[PDB]
Amino acid sequence: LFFMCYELLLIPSFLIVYFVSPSRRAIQASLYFVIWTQLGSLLVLIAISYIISITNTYEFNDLKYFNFTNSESTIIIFLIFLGFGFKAPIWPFHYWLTKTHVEAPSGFSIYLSGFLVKTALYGFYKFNTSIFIDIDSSIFIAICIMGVVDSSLKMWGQTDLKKLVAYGTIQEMNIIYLAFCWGDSCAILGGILFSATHAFLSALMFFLVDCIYRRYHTRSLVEVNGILHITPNLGLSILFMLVFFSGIPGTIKFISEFYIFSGLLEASPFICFILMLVANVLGLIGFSKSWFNATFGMPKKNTKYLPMDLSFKESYIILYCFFFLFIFSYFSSIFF
Amino acid sequence: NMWMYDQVYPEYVISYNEIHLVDQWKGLKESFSQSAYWWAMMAMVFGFYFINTTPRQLGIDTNDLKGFLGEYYGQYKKRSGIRSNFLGLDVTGENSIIQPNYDR
Amino acid sequence: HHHHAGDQADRVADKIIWINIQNRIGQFERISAFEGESLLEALQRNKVAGIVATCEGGEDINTMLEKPIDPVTYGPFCSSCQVVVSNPWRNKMGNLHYLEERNLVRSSYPTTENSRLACCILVEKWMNEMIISIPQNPNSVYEDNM
Amino acid sequence: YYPFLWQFFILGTSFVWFHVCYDPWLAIYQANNAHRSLETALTKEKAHKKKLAEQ
Amino acid sequence: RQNFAKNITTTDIPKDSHHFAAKRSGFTQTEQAPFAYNDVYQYPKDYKPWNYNYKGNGVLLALFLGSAFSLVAYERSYASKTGRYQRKVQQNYYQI
Amino acid sequence: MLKNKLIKFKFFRFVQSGFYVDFIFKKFSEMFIRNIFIYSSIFFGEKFMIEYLTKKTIDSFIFNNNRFNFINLVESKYFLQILTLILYLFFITIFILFYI
Amino acid sequence: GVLSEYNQRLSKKLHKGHLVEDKPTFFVTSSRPGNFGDHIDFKVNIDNWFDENRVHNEHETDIRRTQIYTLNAIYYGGLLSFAR
Amino acid sequence: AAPPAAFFLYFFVPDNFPSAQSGFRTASRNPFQVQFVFAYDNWEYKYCGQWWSMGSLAVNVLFFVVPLFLWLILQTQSDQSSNRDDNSLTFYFSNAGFFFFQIYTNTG
Amino acid sequence: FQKYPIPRYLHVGQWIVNKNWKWNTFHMFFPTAILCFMVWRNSMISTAKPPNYGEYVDPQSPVAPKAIKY
Amino acid sequence: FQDNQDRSRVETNSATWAHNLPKENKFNTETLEKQEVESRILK
Amino acid sequence: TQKLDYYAVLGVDRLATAEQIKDSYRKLAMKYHPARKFQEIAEAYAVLSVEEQRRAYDFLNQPSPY
Numbered sequence A: 001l002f003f004m005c006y007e008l009l010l011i012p013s014f015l016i017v018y019f020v021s022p023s024r025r026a027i028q029a030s031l032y033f034v035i036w037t038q039l040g041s042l043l044v045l046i047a048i049s050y051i052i053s054i055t056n057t058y059e060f061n062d063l064k065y066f067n068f069t070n071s072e073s074t075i076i077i078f079l080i081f082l083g084f085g086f087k088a089p090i091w092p093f094h095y096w097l098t099k100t101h102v103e104a105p106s107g108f109s110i111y112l113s114g115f116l117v118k119t120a121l122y123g124f125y126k127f128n129t130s131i132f133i134d135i136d137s138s139i140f141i142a143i144c145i146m147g148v149v150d151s152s153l154k155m156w157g158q159t160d161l162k163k164l165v166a167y168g169t170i171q172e173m174n175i176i177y178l179a180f181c182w183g184d185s186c187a188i189l190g191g192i193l194f195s196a197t198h199a200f201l202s203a204l205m206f207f208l209v210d211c212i213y214r215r216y217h218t219r220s221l222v223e224v225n226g227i228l229h230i231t232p233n234l235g236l237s238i239l240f241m242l243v244f245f246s247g248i249p250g251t252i253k254f255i256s257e258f259y260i261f262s263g264l265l266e267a268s269p270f271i272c273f274i275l276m277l278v279a280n281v282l283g284l285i286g287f288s289k290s291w292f293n294a295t296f297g298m299p300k301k302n303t304k305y306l307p308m309d310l311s312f313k314e315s316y317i318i319l320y321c322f323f324f325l326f327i328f329s330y331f332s333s334i335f336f
Numbered sequence B: 001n002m003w004m005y006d007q008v009y010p011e012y013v014i015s016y017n018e019i020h021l022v023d024q025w026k027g028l029k030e031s032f033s034q035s036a037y038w039w040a041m042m043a044m045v046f047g048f049y050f051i052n053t054t055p056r057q058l059g060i061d062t063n064d065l066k067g068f069l070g071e072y073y074g075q076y077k078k079r080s081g082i083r084s085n086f087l088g089l090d091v092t093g094e095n096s097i098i099q100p101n102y103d104r
Numbered sequence C: 001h002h003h004h005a006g007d008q009a010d011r012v013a014d015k016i017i018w019i020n021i022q023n024r025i026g027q028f029e030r031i032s033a034f035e036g037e038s039l040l041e042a043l044q045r046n047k048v049a050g051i052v053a054t055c056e057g058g059e060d061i062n063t064m065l066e067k068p069i070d071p072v073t074y075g076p077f078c079s080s081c082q083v084v085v086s087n088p089w090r091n092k093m094g095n096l097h098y099l100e101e102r103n104l105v106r107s108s109y110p111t112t113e114n115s116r117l118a119c120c121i122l123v124e125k126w127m128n129e130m131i132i133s134i135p136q137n138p139n140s141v142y143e144d145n146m
Numbered sequence D: 001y002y003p004f005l006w007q008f009f010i011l012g013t014s015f016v017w018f019h020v021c022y023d024p025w026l027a028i029y030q031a032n033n034a035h036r037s038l039e040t041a042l043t044k045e046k047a048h049k050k051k052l053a054e055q
Numbered sequence E: 001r002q003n004f005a006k007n008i009t010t011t012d013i014p015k016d017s018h019h020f021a022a023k024r025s026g027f028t029q030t031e032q033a034p035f036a037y038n039d040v041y042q043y044p045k046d047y048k049p050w051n052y053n054y055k056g057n058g059v060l061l062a063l064f065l066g067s068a069f070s071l072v073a074y075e076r077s078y079a080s081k082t083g084r085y086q087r088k089v090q091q092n093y094y095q096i
Numbered sequence F: 001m002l003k004n005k006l007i008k009f010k011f012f013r014f015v016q017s018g019f020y021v022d023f024i025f026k027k028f029s030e031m032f033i034r035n036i037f038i039y040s041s042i043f044f045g046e047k048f049m050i051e052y053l054t055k056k057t058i059d060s061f062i063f064n065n066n067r068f069n070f071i072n073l074v075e076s077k078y079f080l081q082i083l084t085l086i087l088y089l090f091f092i093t094i095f096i097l098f099y100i
Numbered sequence G: 001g002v003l004s005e006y007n008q009r010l011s012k013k014l015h016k017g018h019l020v021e022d023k024p025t026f027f028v029t030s031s032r033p034g035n036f037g038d039h040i041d042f043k044v045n046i047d048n049w050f051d052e053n054r055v056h057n058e059h060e061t062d063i064r065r066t067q068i069y070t071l072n073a074i075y076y077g078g079l080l081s082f083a084r
Numbered sequence H: 001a002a003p004p005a006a007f008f009l010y011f012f013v014p015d016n017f018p019s020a021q022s023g024f025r026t027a028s029r030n031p032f033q034v035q036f037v038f039a040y041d042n043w044e045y046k047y048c049g050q051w052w053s054m055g056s057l058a059v060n061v062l063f064f065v066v067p068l069f070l071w072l073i074l075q076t077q078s079d080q081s082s083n084r085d086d087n088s089l090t091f092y093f094s095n096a097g098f099f100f101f102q103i104y105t106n107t108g
Numbered sequence I: 001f002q003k004y005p006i007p008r009y010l011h012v013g014q015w016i017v018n019k020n021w022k023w024n025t026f027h028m029f030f031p032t033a034i035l036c037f038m039v040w041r042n043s044m045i046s047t048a049k050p051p052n053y054g055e056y057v058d059p060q061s062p063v064a065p066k067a068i069k070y
Numbered sequence J: 001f002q003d004n005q006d007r008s009r010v011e012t013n014s015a016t017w018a019h020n021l022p023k024e025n026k027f028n029t030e031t032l033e034k035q036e037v038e039s040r041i042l043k
Numbered sequence K: 001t002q003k004l005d006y007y008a009v010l011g012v013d014r015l016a017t018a019e020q021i022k023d024s025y026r027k028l029a030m031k032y033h034p035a036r037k038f039q040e041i042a043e044a045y046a047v048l049s050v051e052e053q054r055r056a057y058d059f060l061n062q063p064s065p066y
């Protein structure tokens, strides 16, 4: 039932992208989404069929009384890692995610970054924890780190804001997926917290992009800037989003970074430094350039068509995202 | 993103006021050629001060030898980081990425 | 267009693009078309024989008629709207799209170097009094008779 | 145009040749035989001695 | 497009009619017919568009009652945690 | 000392420009930005390592394979395909039986 | 790229793998001494490598000379590493 | 440079419901801006092997061989962890499949 | 700079003077002081301080630093 | 890699037995030269 | 240098008479006579002026339409 519920999520998503998206390029983007996500689901299906046929049972408990050999364990771990990394986008498979975010409607983009990809982290975790694997996780760790580096190095050369948000989603999804590469150790707490952190951050960023697109009828830096000085609330929201994404020590982004980076520094010092420098400096600089240039300037072009500021709905949604980050920094310490 | 885009006064992302130097290599050449003068002046100043000055008696307080210096050598005298585990766990401080090295 | 307040409407006669046609039976025809339209639509509105048009122009989103051809287009689907364009107009048309050339050279009937798919032509101002020939196009499937 | 500078260039090329042909083979050779080291043998001996002493 | 009705029944829309008077007389042979309704919106004259015009006490009362309930519930929980019917107050308290 | 090149405007503007350190550092930073970021990251990564090597390899393989395919079956090709299937399935089976 | 260079070199027309002239060819030096008559009827060249082996870089020749020096330097550097 | 005459524009699905926020006032677009907006998406390579030398060959090669470099560095630091008895790069199995904070109760 | 008109519909802060700024200053200052007083009163519970002049810490007193019994 | 400048396929093969020198394409739309027509008319 | 199309440089079609080439060269020479474009014009006219040279140039090209 776990696998069936994971598989059930594709048809509504494809239908939403196909029938609700206004852009014409969304027709092919839905096909890309389907084909990559279904390749990943096929890999996961092969692994599940392997487990079910070898052990004629459907309970996670019974796996405690059966042992898998080295070959079967290696096959299963590779299959589940690749299959769940198709959906939670690992380095070589994020073309579908980029296209789908660029072409999809704003609400479904919020749902896709905020929640849907997380469905891959959960299932993998379960199948990672129920089996004894005697392989070295260096290959998976390297794949995840390559994803982080590749995504964060591409942020400077983005003019579309939605594509930039998609690349940020890719880098933090790969960071979270890294935390599950040590089994059932204490590394899972940082990943669990940072999943919610990314959910709220991505929801906020895509909502801001939607507000800009509905105000100015564009989401390209070459066409819109000076979002401040006209509708200042949107510019203030952009700047505060940039602060929270940078990770001020008062929020849960800093907490998740601290967890994962402490563990990685102990596990691999030079790797930790390289990942930290690539993610928190270069990608941050590209992100900040593309977002600052849109906030500041003079909106001179079309004064006859300039829009009004935020409505109550958008203001309250943005405020609630900020409040949730700040206040979930205060959750009970028994967990995490 | 090599340009700061603007509907009024768009700019290049990097300003170059010293454009009379066409590129960075001629800039480095010019910088060294003109800094040779500062090198010569520093050499003259040091030559004057080396001819006309005696080194001073500078150090730590001789009454505090059992203080800052004593603790540094005492840390190496007491190899406390390689003692046995207080629970008897068959591990020592040497079994870590950050480990003591008392013969450095 | 360009109009001022109080102006009268232009005449449809002055906006007609004329196409001169040699039939499959060696007879001559004159056809009226308009700019922004495909040649296939004008030919079918004027009921010109010799074209089968099995696929009826192709898809509706990424078409061959858009002035910059979109890379992820699928191109023509049946290659059964072929016409032969005379030298000046055909030379002005330019080189073929690779998908259109692939569909043209793959037809079951013989073609020429001036062959051109009608649904891949967008009628322009400079196509006035253009001379074309339409030999009969091949049939493909069972439903072509229906 | 300065022949002794060109000779220095040739020396640099020889240095690059040597290090290119030297570094990776030594690196993989040392990484292949990490578990066959006197430090590992001494670690095992000390562990066994501790076990036998507190036995 | 919006399809809701604007002539509501809950209340009458605040408006005035002195602004935008109709002509109704002295017409020429070339000008257009006058407009019909001409009524315009009237604001309460104490309205500030730049802030919430909120004069209630409900939100403050609800938050205060929630905080007071939190305090009394914590007192009860602490008394129950120490195995007592009420908190035993020490005669002296010191810095933590 | 009756002549001094340090009182001329060339040396003066050299010192006033902070020894041209900012100009030199910014030129190298521009080279890094342009090359690494633009070319390597977006073009190399996305276009070749992500778009090409994942989608366009299969696309071009399919296109080049279809380059050698007749969309319309002819009778001689049909008969030749049947005969080739028979003869060379037999050959491959007997080759596996004998020498493999 | 190397693939492009291979693609251009794949289309060359050769006689059994050798780039040679398909017809007899005669050349005369117009500034030759007057005691030299006409070209005798002997096929002295089978190839035309004097004209085919050209890169047409007469506007920049010192660059190619420097490149040849660099290749020689790399070869000498390997040999000198072994000698060292 | 003359303004572009043919370029990729915005397109919408048939029977699309238009966005009508803030009075639904849409302005005419700039051809150069729209051209830039849609240029990168439609850009493609021209011949095989063009990517390698596009920009800097050394930098492109270094970018290409990044995953191998990361794997090798991880291998070296795993060598360092092995002799110091540090956390190795393995899927640790110490909870015997029991999940993090999971309710384990029975019925009956 | 010379003053220029600002649109009425924009809630921006160029050249704004509130005529009732004295009462607003009062009603923003005093409750702020009360809130800060409550925060400071709460925080003085968790404030430390070295011993005063002429005082010494008895090493055997409960307040003195302690080790751990294993 | 897909080269759009190469449009050759099995459909475009134009090798005929009669012509020792192969023709440019498979469209048999080659016209006579001007001097040939004049010479034949003179004949 | 780089590969150059002499007919495109002179602004004449391939099946153009010699006098047309002369007129085109004169028209283009009145304009750029007093650098690179004039050199291209001169090279193209030098090649296309001689009937044998023009024939040899045309044989190697094997022109495409359009």
Ligand SMILES: COC1=C(OC)C(=O)C(C/C=C(\C)CC/C=C(/C)CC/C=C(\C)CC/C=C(/C)CC/C=C(\C)CC/C=C(\C)CC/C=C(\C)CC/C=C(\C)CC/C=C(/C)CCC=C(C)C)=C(C)C1=O
Binding pocket: B028, B031, B032, B035, B036, B038, B039, B040, B042, B043, B046, B047, B050, F018, F019, F020, F021, F024
């Ligand atoms: C004037 O600056 C300069 C700048 O602004 C700070 C600049 O921006 C730049 C521009 C730089 C860039 C664009 C980027 C380059 C990056 C850099 C890091 C370059 C920075 C260069 C410098 C900071 C200049 C320093 C270099 C020199 C050569 C200074 C010369 C100083 C002297 C000649 C002092 C004289 C010293 C003497 C005579 C020592 C002789 C010894 C004895 C007499 C015996 C007594 C001494 C001892 C017993 C102990 C000392 C012994 C030794 C061996 C140490 C001596 C070593 C030394 C270096 C002195 C340049 C070029 C520059 O140039």
Ligand SMILES: CCCCCCCCCCCCCCCCCC(=O)OC[C@H](COP(=O)([O-])OCC[N+](C)(C)C)OC(=O)CCCCCCCCCCCCCCCCC
Binding pocket: B041, B044, B045, B048, F007
């Ligand atoms: C062993 C000793 C070696 C000494 C080496 C030489 C040291 C010289 C003094 C230090 C360096 C000063 C560099 C110039 C800084 C000011 C530049 C500037 O803006 O100038 C414009 C200022 C103000 O003028 P102004 O800006 O109004 O305009 C004047 C016109 N222009 C711009 C063209 C200059 O003028 C000066 O600085 C005047 C020149 C100063 C010359 C100093 C000579 C010193 C001679 C040596 C004395 C040694 C005593 C013994 C020392 C013993 C210990 C070492």
Ligand code: FES
Binding pocket: C040, C053, C054, C055, C056, C057, C058, C076, C077, C078, C079, C080, C081, C117, C118, C119, C120
């Ligand atoms: S009608 Fe089918 S290809 Fe034109």
